[PDB]
Design an enzyme around this catalytic site. Sequence first.
Site, PDB file in Angstrom:
ATOM      1  N   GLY A   1       0.862  -1.229   0.062  1.00  0.00           N
ATOM      2  CA  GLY A   1      -0.050  -0.055  -0.080  1.00  0.00           C
ATOM      3  C   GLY A   1       0.641   1.340  -0.010  1.00  0.00           C
ATOM      4  O   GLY A   1       2.037   1.196   0.172  1.00  0.00           O
ATOM      5  N   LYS A   2       0.251   2.384  -0.458  1.00  0.00           N
ATOM      6  CA  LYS A   2       1.034   3.747  -0.338  1.00  0.00           C
ATOM      7  C   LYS A   2      -0.123   4.541   0.256  1.00  0.00           C
ATOM      8  O   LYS A   2      -1.237   4.563   0.348  1.00  0.00           O
ATOM      9  CB  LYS A   2       1.124   3.972  -1.788  1.00  0.00           C
ATOM     10  N   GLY A   3       0.588   5.671   0.848  1.00  0.00           N
ATOM     11  CA  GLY A   3      -0.488   6.559   1.331  1.00  0.00           C
ATOM     12  C   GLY A   3       0.506   8.164   1.216  1.00  0.00           C
ATOM     13  O   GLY A   3       1.514   8.140   1.009  1.00  0.00           O
TER      14      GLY A   3
ATOM     15  N   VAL B   1       3.486   1.045   3.058  1.00  0.00           N
ATOM     16  CA  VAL B   1       3.350  -0.161   3.911  1.00  0.00           C
ATOM     17  C   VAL B   1       3.816  -1.431   3.052  1.00  0.00           C
ATOM     18  O   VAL B   1       3.095  -1.642   1.878  1.00  0.00           O
ATOM     19  CB  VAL B   1       1.944  -0.401   4.368  1.00  0.00           C
TER      20      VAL B   1
ATOM     21  N   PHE C   1       3.099  -3.936  12.292  1.00  0.00           N
ATOM     22  CA  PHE C   1       1.916  -4.076  12.673  1.00  0.00           C
ATOM     23  C   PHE C   1       1.662  -5.704  12.457  1.00  0.00           C
ATOM     24  O   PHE C   1       2.214  -6.439  11.549  1.00  0.00           O
ATOM     25  CB  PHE C   1       0.794  -3.464  11.889  1.00  0.00           C
TER      26      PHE C   1
ATOM     27  N   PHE D   1       1.369   9.215   4.314  1.00  0.00           N
ATOM     28  CA  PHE D   1       2.495   8.965   5.091  1.00  0.00           C
ATOM     29  C   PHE D   1       3.588   8.478   4.565  1.00  0.00           C
ATOM     30  O   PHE D   1       4.714   8.478   5.351  1.00  0.00           O
ATOM     31  CB  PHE D   1       1.754   8.024   6.245  1.00  0.00           C
ATOM     32  N   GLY D   2       3.643   7.742   3.542  1.00  0.00           N
ATOM     33  CA  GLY D   2       4.678   6.918   3.166  1.00  0.00           C
ATOM     34  C   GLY D   2       4.170   5.659   2.568  1.00  0.00           C
ATOM     35  O   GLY D   2       3.271   5.525   1.707  1.00  0.00           O
TER      36      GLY D   2
ATOM     37  N   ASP E   1      -9.768  10.569  10.527  1.00  0.00           N
ATOM     38  CA  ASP E   1      -9.702  10.161   9.261  1.00  0.00           C
ATOM     39  C   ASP E   1     -10.402   8.707   9.008  1.00  0.00           C
ATOM     40  O   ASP E   1      -9.987   8.151   8.184  1.00  0.00           O
ATOM     41  CB  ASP E   1      -8.403  10.180   8.675  1.00  0.00           C
TER      42      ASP E   1
HETATM   43  C1  LIG Z   1      -2.830  -5.408   5.265  1.00  0.00           C
HETATM   44  N1  LIG Z   1      -2.382  -4.134   5.664  1.00  0.00           N
HETATM   45  C2  LIG Z   1      -2.898  -3.186   4.749  1.00  0.00           C
HETATM   46  C3  LIG Z   1      -3.943  -3.150   4.081  1.00  0.00           C
HETATM   47  C4  LIG Z   1      -4.259  -2.225   3.329  1.00  0.00           C
HETATM   48  C5  LIG Z   1      -3.263  -1.318   2.422  1.00  0.00           C
HETATM   49  C6  LIG Z   1      -2.198  -1.309   2.991  1.00  0.00           C
HETATM   50  C7  LIG Z   1      -1.753  -2.316   4.124  1.00  0.00           C
HETATM   51  C8  LIG Z   1      -2.370  -3.730   6.898  1.00  0.00           C
HETATM   52  N2  LIG Z   1      -2.415  -4.261   7.800  1.00  0.00           N
HETATM   53  C9  LIG Z   1      -1.952  -4.167   9.121  1.00  0.00           C
HETATM   54  C10 LIG Z   1      -1.758  -2.722   9.530  1.00  0.00           C
HETATM   55  C11 LIG Z   1      -1.881  -1.841   8.527  1.00  0.00           C
HETATM   56  C12 LIG Z   1      -1.695  -0.373   8.746  1.00  0.00           C
HETATM   57  C13 LIG Z   1      -1.355  -0.036   9.835  1.00  0.00           C
HETATM   58  N3  LIG Z   1      -1.638   1.564   9.750  1.00  0.00           N
HETATM   59  N4  LIG Z   1      -1.939   1.834   8.449  1.00  0.00           N
HETATM   60  N5  LIG Z   1      -1.909   3.071   8.207  1.00  0.00           N
HETATM   61  C14 LIG Z   1      -2.343   3.136   6.755  1.00  0.00           C
HETATM   62  C15 LIG Z   1      -2.480   1.873   5.978  1.00  0.00           C
HETATM   63  C16 LIG Z   1      -2.354   0.634   6.336  1.00  0.00           C
HETATM   64  C17 LIG Z   1      -2.077   0.682   7.747  1.00  0.00           C
HETATM   65  N6  LIG Z   1      -2.058  -2.226   7.015  1.00  0.00           N
END
Ligand SMILES: CN(c1ccccc1)c1nccc(-c2cnn3ncccc23)n1
EC number: 2.7.11.23
Length: 347
Positions: free
Chosen positions: A32-34, A39, A104, A36-37, A153
């Site tokens: 994932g992207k945001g 994942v 996480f 914030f940076g 948010d």
């Molecule tokens: C599976 N996963 C995920 C799912 C969808 C998109 C990107 C990552 C995930 N699983 C556990 C925690 C998080 C998580 C904690 N903080 N944020 N903030 C922003 C975005 C994600 C997260 N994302």
Amino acid sequence: VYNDGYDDDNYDYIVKNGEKWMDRYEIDSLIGKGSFGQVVKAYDRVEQEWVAIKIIKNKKAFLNQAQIEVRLLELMNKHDTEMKYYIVHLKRHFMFRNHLCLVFEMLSYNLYDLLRNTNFRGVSLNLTRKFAQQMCTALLFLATPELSIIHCDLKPENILLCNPKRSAIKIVDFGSSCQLGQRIYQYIQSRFYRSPEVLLGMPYDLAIDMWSLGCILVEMHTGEPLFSGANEVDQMNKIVEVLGIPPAHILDQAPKARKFFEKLPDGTWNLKKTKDGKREYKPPGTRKLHNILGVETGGPGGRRAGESGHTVADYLKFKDLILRMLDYDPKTRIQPYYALQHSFFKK
Ligand SMILES: CN(c1ccccc1)c1nccc(-c2cnn3ncccc23)n1
């Protein structure tokens, strides 16, 4: 050359698949992207489990914000209640190549992806109710006085399935969160889910999260955003289409009232006059939620006609709860403890 080569032009770490960090984490891939940076998916060889690592941007403003997120996460995760498991578990954090990294538990896809998988037909009312009860329990947890945390948010992207093929959810991304005493922004919440008090530049509290939840629950069942403004003016006008002009006692105290409204000689408020009278919005209060939901005509777009779990009585209970969540007055907007007692949740 940014960060001795490890960063791109956007303060993000250049993620490389298969890289091992600190002789512990094996980076699988970007997930994932945001703003914030990023994942990434990684394997923790020490704990022998898959984890999600939030790589915060290598920039002071984003780092300072993620520190607030770390403080709030650790405060929630250590609380002595069962209600705390609707919040994602922060396992640990570390600095790596000048990036703050948050580790996480691994979750599944968000509720937006789930909507995309129905081709934006929306999920069933029964599933919406399950999401609604969990989110209400989560907002009750955030409301315990020692926490008093405003997520700030809530949106479908920030609610995650624990397991892709089960209904349990957790809330993520406390990057813009604050506590009741420590609020530091004015332009907050993703626009579709932004509360009236924020649009009006007024003080706000935990009730803004309940506004967002109301918008989210409607979208989960209809498949499309309730208030899809292209900008703040459009957003306020779209809220007014459904709910009417906000009451005078709010607008009389709203610093940004005249960004959308004008006060008449008798003290009543209307929308600001539109250019050459150009017609763009339904008159105030005429886009009825009763019809958006299809309360008496087979649900959203008539698509639930002939299905169980979608009676007129069900829709009426759902609509009442949503309207209590979308109360213009943050002082009387339904609060989590009483929302959980609503007849929509009696089963
Ligand atoms: C599976 N996963 C995920 C799912 C969808 C998109 C990107 C990552 C995930 N699983 C556990 C925690 C998080 C998580 C904690 N903080 N944020 N903030 C922003 C975005 C994600 C997260 N994302």
